[PDB]
């Protein structure tokens, strides 16, 4: 061919993460949030929010927004106010900044020159600009000017799966390709003051946090590179009877989510079939039936923690051992819902805990695993993973 | 790797196009535009705009916006009024609708059941929403609910190249994959009234039009399918010294472009090296030096017609024969600048004219060609195409 292809499976060769420096402990967030938005007098609504925070599964989050910025930009503190211009101004610089920070850590781990990066996949649901955040990152890092970019704006919470699905084909179909994959998510586009008329917004204020994660992906690893996971199969599903379950509109008041169905119920009702169909396709239909794991407790799990009820209902319906959701719940606890970045943070946490506890593989000692993104559609993104053996 | 890959090059198997029903003749557009925006008193600015339209290379455009919609939505007619909410309301419906019309035509040509579409790549710079226009189109067409989607928002005018670059890997790395690739672009996010204080906006009012194009792409064509082009190589380049050349910001007043450098100058100064490096990589560095075309006049050309000066200056600097740009200029003339969709309309026009005129291949009788997208960066997207031989 005029462009050669790679031989082996796309492999994760490094993972780096970054967060803003301002930490918000969840136990004191209702006070902070109702104070800074001049809403301290809304006693009933504040109690409702306190209960939301107490039930969130979150201990702390990191956010770029803090008191000084919010005081200087009162349209962000209002409960429903035209404010997109300010939100855009913040997002168009902070999203690639946080992405740069994560990327530098990934590249340092990887240990290869940044000039060897041939492709970039950048994902965010925080703002849009032309050129996009992919271009900004390319400039900030000094990547080769011929880097081949895939800019994925406004997809929401499932896109941690999406970027891996997309990057798999890039890595596998291009000999020598090394793909930088970045998810960077920040809450400046959704932050607003509290009101009873915008309760979906209020739920987001209990859950969403800031973070970026960067992966180096490539097929046919060099001896100097260090695999930690392989991508082996990907799929997408729009779940039945889920129209309008999660909508998000970018308006002059900022990004506004509207949820209209029982998201945990829909996900947990259908996830068994999603997984059976995925593993049947990956193993049975490819002539590798013998290698198919015997149950969902015999694989490792990386699930998007959109809220704790999703995790709880999936665990119950699928009869998961109590440890299956542990790595996922740890990231929810320590960072909150960072949208697309969560599953990459969880992947990093899992490989690090597996090494720390002297397990046999990067996937909690198990060979195969599933990574799941959940978001608007209602879309489930599924990626089947293989672990890498540890000393 | 638990998932089989395809063997041959990604192949275009069908192309369908659509446009809104309202036709705007360019000769009368200054009149329409200054009338509907209540700017008739701006006689000097109208004279300027008339000259812009006379120099645009455009005979007509199609737009969803019309007098009825603009009268119903006066914030669109003002020169700088907050109006993004209205623009979004229009775009989130019209973008997938136009994409559906184009896709149905592509699928009819293709002749296979729509259930065989495994992947969807959807590209627009007109609005954003969650779920996206990809999801909306999936619902409108009744595609399989397990369709694997790649939603590309807000990239601008180079993205006709981008979607082919991206879809190439999808089709080639997945045995049996059939990819619906859709570019759907409309002017409701950029339309605004005239001002001496927003001339970049005014150039866009002379050039941008509405349209969607849909391509079916797949490797290893079946006997019942009909190849018309193959994708063989792709590249991207951020051109030197081009920061700020084309910026676009989505604001409460809608989408606003700001051009801070000489776009035709930058593209024409650098395109020789882009093309030389592309053909060197594709042929020489892959062990196929002997099949590399001898000159730029020995390949067919599909260039994004961002404006007529880009085409003129590339033609001059590259010493192209006068008809190399004809297919491109024809689409600019008949439809205007439909952003990412243009190069796909040009691909369709080229295969159709080649057949009509009984030429030996779909690429004006030539074997190899280049497709070029131009946009913010300044980014050039390059795709190297092989034509398909015709029977006559």
UniProtKB/Swiss-Prot annotation, chain B:
InterPro entries cross-referenced by the UniProt entry: Chalcone/stilbene_synt_C, Chalcone/stilbene_synt_N, Chalcone/stilbene_synthase_AS, Polyketide_synthase_type-III, Thiolase-like
GO process annotations (BP): flavonoid biosynthetic process; polyketide biosynthetic process
Catalysed reaction equations from the record: (E)-4-coumaroyl-CoA + 3 malonyl-CoA + 3 H(+) = 2',4,4',6'-tetrahydroxychalcone + 3 CO2 + 4 CoA
UniProt keywords, alphabetically: Acyltransferase, Flavonoid biosynthesis, Transferase
SUPFAM superfamilies: Thiolase-like
MF annotations from Gene Ontology: naringenin-chalcone synthase activity
Keyword Mitochondrion part of the UniProt annotation: no
Role: The primary product of this enzyme is 4,2',4',6'-tetrahydroxychalcone (also termed naringenin-chalcone or chalcone) which can under specific conditions spontaneously isomerize into naringenin.
Protein name, UniProt field: Chalcone synthase
Species: Equisetum arvense
